[PDB]
Amino acid sequence: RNDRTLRRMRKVVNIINAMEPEMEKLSDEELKGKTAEFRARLEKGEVLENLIPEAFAVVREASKRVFGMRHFDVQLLGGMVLNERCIAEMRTGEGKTLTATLPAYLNALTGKGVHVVTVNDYLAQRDAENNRPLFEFLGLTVGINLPGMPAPAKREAYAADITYGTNNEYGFDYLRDNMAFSPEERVQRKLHYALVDEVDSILIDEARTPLIISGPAEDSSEMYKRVNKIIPHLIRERGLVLIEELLVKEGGESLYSPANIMLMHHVTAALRAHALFTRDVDYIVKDGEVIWSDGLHQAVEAKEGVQIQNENQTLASITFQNYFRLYEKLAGMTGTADTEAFEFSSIYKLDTVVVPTNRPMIRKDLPDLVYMTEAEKIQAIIEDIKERTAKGQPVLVGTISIEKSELVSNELTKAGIKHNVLNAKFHANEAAIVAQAGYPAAVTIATNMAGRGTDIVLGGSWQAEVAALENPTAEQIEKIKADWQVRHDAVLEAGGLHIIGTERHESRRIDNQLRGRSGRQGDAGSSRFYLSMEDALMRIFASDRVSGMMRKLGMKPGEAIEHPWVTKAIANAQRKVESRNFDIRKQLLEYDDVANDQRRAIYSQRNELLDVSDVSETINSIREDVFKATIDAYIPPQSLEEMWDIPGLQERLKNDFDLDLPIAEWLDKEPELHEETLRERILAQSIEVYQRKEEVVGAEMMRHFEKGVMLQTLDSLWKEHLAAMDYLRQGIHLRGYAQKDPKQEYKRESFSMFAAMLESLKYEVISTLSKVQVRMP
């Protein structure tokens, strides 16, 4: 890791820089042609990574001509990092935007597409539109993906060499591609390269945010009707023994758990709407309706024979994490937050890299200061502000709440320090203050600072000064720049922006984001964090004496020392809280792996179906398994004749497979028969009746109706399964309790239920193709 991979990349950077004159000599057309040359070399078997130096140099030259921007060495380093499965930490102002142009080019060369993942659509459109001329200069096409975009335009967007889009719409496009009924319906290609704009939020904070496609269901009016057909048998354990037995329908064992809940909230409702809601008494039936709660309304409609009011359910679901783990290559960017490299490597095998700034980082991060009380802390803070503003140095003070901002505001005013508070209610004022936030001695209080935030220009923004002018002359802009130079230089001499944190937050990342506001692009700066024994943060030592021992080092109302071990102790606490968080996270991700693997498995199988034209083989093969398994249920393999249930098999075949065979007559006529030949008879009859229907309809039509039925049934059982899993998982605050562990039983019932779903899949597919009505000559 380390400078170990950084010096490797610096070596390459030297090669790229060394390449510059070469690239300066080439024509526009020769630069354009480079892409084709690289692609020809890749086709002829060159390793992409070997092209990094040249390709980057080409891109940089292209940017020099097109944008008039020459990527810095560190941008090249970042681009090289982003070629790996790595997270690139790039300080604010280091031009994450421009840097990202490099690995997009490089990973487009293989001709398999690039997905640039933005935080929102505006940036996707902006970056796409702004970068379009660069990549066309180098003979590549750029796509933009938006929610609500027509499928052909989405297809166009994904078929372009480099695509820009948001995280969400990519995920929804995946779900929709995995709801397609033909491969031409797909919008995406094979998921090749994903570059994610803010991985802190997107891959960590939003890791578990579900992306969901919902719809009106379909499988209403079913389960309900069959559950309804069972209850009127019942009279005022038995009843329960009788109920479970009476499912020559859904489900050895055993409604009651863990899965067969569905059935429970389905039954207690059959039942519950029979003696519990009296017919024309508690409600009325008018105009095909019942005129409720928990499946109970739908049951009444099943009982009274009404149209059941089928209603939204989840059709498709995925977390960001589980979607992005599908890409062949994955990379991302963030602000100097990170702190979680090992987490990214654990969860994603993403190594993270701190990319050095173009100019040196010269912010002085001073040691944390600790006081007995809030009041003394505040006093020291006031004193610090007073000293630095006395030097002409501007200050940004960060607080943890509006009340604290007010508190410090009042105190500063009490001390005669002019300042402005940034109030979330007043956006115009915020922008107006931030314009002057870096003016000599300016003092600004911010509450729970957002993230990255508007650059605060040291000495003020002269650019806002001209944007202010009514009718800007030439010599006004000289007075302005000259004055600005002096202010900027004076502020730089006074030490740049000072950052004051009045508390530390429970999460240090917030502190790092506050602190990140100073020292940008090599500007001078400093930071200081202050703490007290009555800070919220000083609660996490869950012990009054313990925290109360620090009071014996004394502090002396303003005669403090600084103990560099305190800062380490504090950082250690916060990294232990973070470790605690990660332990919890890993546990939750262990639960997520079940559904993730289930989805992955089912979608792999679904796409196997989708990718093939002709499902004959699969049909025949699962036909064998289904009928074999089905006969086995009435004729146990290698058992005696007295165990056979022929009426059961004749009813089951007629009812579920529309196949009326004289098996009783077969057995009683030839004592020659034997199982295998009976199984072959049934098979042969089903086959010939089916091939007859094919001869009625045609081959092509059979292949395509087969596919459709496979997919429809797959989808329907999947959506049902998602819901069963949903109820199962949410049910786990009453199922796993007294002594025995929850989880583990969960994975068992998940696997059991998923297995059940695949065999039911086979059964229902074959049943459907066997029951489909054709007018037989």
Author numbering: 13 to 248, 276 to 290, 295 to 334, 349 to 834
Task: Give the original sentences from the paper that presented this experimental model.
SecAΔMBD crystallised as a symmetric dimer in a head-to-tail configuration. Consistent with previous studies, the structure of the PPXD was less well defined relative to the other domains of the catalytic core, consistent with the idea that the PPXD is structurally mobile. However, because the FLD was not resolved, its effect on the structure of SecA could not be determined. To investigate how the CTT affects the conformation of SecA in solution, we investigated the structures of SecA, SecAΔCTT and SecAΔMBD using small-angle x-ray scattering (SAXS). The resulting models suggested that the PPXD was positioned considerably closer to NBD2 (i.e. more ‘open’) in SecA and SecAΔMBD than in SecAΔCTT (p=2.0×10−5 and 1.1 × 10−7, respectively). In models of SecAΔMBD and SecAΔCTT, the PPXDs in the two protomers of the dimers were positioned asymmetrically (p=1.8×10−8 and 0.0085, respectively). Disruption of the MBD alone (i) increases the affinity of SecA for the ribosome, (ii) decreases the affinity of SecA for substrate protein, (iii) inhibits the ATPase activity of SecA, (iv) increases the thermal stability of SecA, (v) prevents SecA from undergoing a conformational change upon binding to nascent substrate protein and (vi) causes a defect in SecA function in vivo. However, disruption of both the MBD and the FLD results in a protein that behaves very similarly to full-length SecA, indicating that the FLD mediates these effects. Our work suggests that enclosure of the FLD by the PPXD has the opposite effect—that is, autoinhibition of SecA. We propose that the MBD is the key for unlocking this autoinhibited conformation in the full-length protein.
